[PDB]
Amino acid sequence: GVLKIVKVYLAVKRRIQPGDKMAGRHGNKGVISKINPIEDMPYDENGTPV
């Protein structure tokens, strides 16, 4: 009872946002609560932001 079958593949691209889960390798999982700008992040004496 099936004549023809069409299969469509959609390739979504999923950037991170507030809410996305993240984890390390040592059981320290977490959830992204905010995306904080580069001017607000803490920088060291050389200038590289965290």
Site for other proteins in 11-40 (CB under 8 A): 11-13, 15, 17-19, 21, 31-34, 37-40
Q: How far is CA 46 from the centre of its chain?
A: 27
Q: How far is the CB of 28 from other proteins (least distance, A)?
A: 14
Compare residues 28 and 33 and give the one whose CB is closer to other proteins: 33
Q: Is residue 17 within 8 Å of 32, Cβ to Cβ?
A: yes
Residue whose C-alpha is closest to residue 35's, from 13, 11, 17, 9 = 17
49 forms bridges with which residues in the sheet? 43
Residue ranges binding other proteins (CB under 8 A): 2-13, 15, 17-19, 21, 31-34, 37-40, 43, 45-49
